[PDB]
Amino acid sequence: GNYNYLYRLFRKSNLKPFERDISTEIYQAGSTPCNGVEGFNCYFPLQS
Amino acid sequence: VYSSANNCTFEYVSQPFLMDLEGKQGNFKNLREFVFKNIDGYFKIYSKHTPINLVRDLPQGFSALEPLVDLPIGINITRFQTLLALHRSYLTPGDS
Amino acid sequence: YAWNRKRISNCVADYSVLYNSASFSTFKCYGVSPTKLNDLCFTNVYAD
């Protein structure tokens, strides 16, 4: 099973033409405290 | 500057000839103009060089800049900074 | 998310090799028609 090809789930705004962005900071649904950690309502940024 | 660069998607270098290395005081000999813009995944750079008569401000008159290079970046660029060079002399201790 | 970009330059390129090939499921072209590609010279080519 090859999971490796990652794509971007979320972003502040839509991607631009020929733009690319790596940033994999943990995305938080709503509680603020999680900082760089995947908590209860903080999910890993990139899906594949 | 760096121990190693494990990854660098783009890396390039231009021609080797020389320019002023030394610490010498004087009058501003020249003016170098540049434009640095990013559009649609690419970074475009332009330039123009001239000798100049007056020190303090940008001169009157007008001339356009020719394009030097166009590079595929992709980066979602927010900011920039300017870099300066140092000089080590026998007079100076030569330390950071 | 990471998509690769390769600059292609200083050469002759026979597009017909690509066009003729069975290997591609979809050939779609936006600005040009595939037969014509051999007839043209390109200022820059990029293989995303």
From Swiss-Prot, chain A:
Disulfide topology: C34-C42
Top-level taxon in the UniProt lineage: Viruses
Record annotation: effect of changing Q47N: Reduced host ACE2-binding affinity in vitro
Effect seen on changing Y7F: Decreased HLA binding to NF9 epitope. Increased binding affinity to human ACE2
Impact noted for substituting E38K: In strain: Beta/B.1.351, Eta/B.1.525, Theta/P.3, Iota/B.1.526, B.1.1.318, Gamma/P.1, Zeta/P.2 and Mu/B.1.621; May enhance affinity to human ACE2 receptor
Annotated effect of mutating E38Q: In strain: Kappa/B.1.617.1
Location of region: Disordered: 9-44
Region called Immunodominant HLA epitope recognized by the CD8+, residue ranges: 2-10
Summary of the function given for this chain in its UniProt record: Attaches the virion to the cell membrane by interacting with host receptor, initiating the infection. The major receptor is host ACE2. When S2/S2' has been cleaved, binding to the receptor triggers direct fusion at the cell membrane. When S2/S2' has not been cleaved, binding to the receptor results in internalization of the virus by endocytosis using host TFRC and GRM2 and leading to fusion of the virion membrane with the host endosomal membrane. Alternatively, may use NRP1/NRP2 and integrin as entry receptors.
Subunit structure as annotated in this protein's UniProt entry: Binds to host ACE2. RBD also interacts with the N-linked glycan on 'Asn-90' of ACE2. Cleavage of S generates a polybasic C-terminal sequence on S1 that binds to host Neuropilin-1 (NRP1) and Neuropilin-2 (NRP2) receptors. Interacts with host integrin alpha-5/beta-1 (ITGA5:ITGB1) and with ACE2 in complex with integrin alpha-5/beta-1 (ITGA5:ITGB1). May interact via cytoplasmic c-terminus with M protein. May interact (via N-terminus) with host bilirubin and biliverdin, thereby preventing antibody binding to the SARS-CoV-2 spike NTD via an allosteric mechanism.
Protein name: Spike protein S1
Organism: Severe acute respiratory syndrome coronavirus 2 (2019-nCoV)
From Swiss-Prot, chain B:
Effect of N76Q: Increased resistance to neutralizing antibodies
Outcome recorded upon mutating V55G: In strain: Omicron/BA.2, Omicron/BA.2.12.1, Omicron/BA.2.75, Omicron/BA.4, Omicron/BA.5, Omicron/BQ.1.1
Region (Disordered): 15-27
Recorded consequence of changing D95N: In strain: Lambda/C.37
Residues listed as glycosylation sites in the UniProt record: N7, N76
Domain of life where this protein originates: Viruses
Consequence of substituting R32K: Partial loss of biliverdin affinity
Role summary: Attaches the virion to the cell membrane by interacting with host receptor, initiating the infection. The major receptor is host ACE2. When S2/S2' has been cleaved, binding to the receptor triggers direct fusion at the cell membrane. When S2/S2' has not been cleaved, binding to the receptor results in internalization of the virus by endocytosis using host TFRC and GRM2 and leading to fusion of the virion membrane with the host endosomal membrane. Alternatively, may use NRP1/NRP2 and integrin as entry receptors.
Quaternary structure (record): Binds to host ACE2. RBD also interacts with the N-linked glycan on 'Asn-90' of ACE2. Cleavage of S generates a polybasic C-terminal sequence on S1 that binds to host Neuropilin-1 (NRP1) and Neuropilin-2 (NRP2) receptors. Interacts with host integrin alpha-5/beta-1 (ITGA5:ITGB1) and with ACE2 in complex with integrin alpha-5/beta-1 (ITGA5:ITGB1). May interact via cytoplasmic c-terminus with M protein. May interact (via N-terminus) with host bilirubin and biliverdin, thereby preventing antibody binding to the SARS-CoV-2 spike NTD via an allosteric mechanism.
Protein name: Spike protein S1
Shown part of the complete sequence: 159 to 254 of 1273
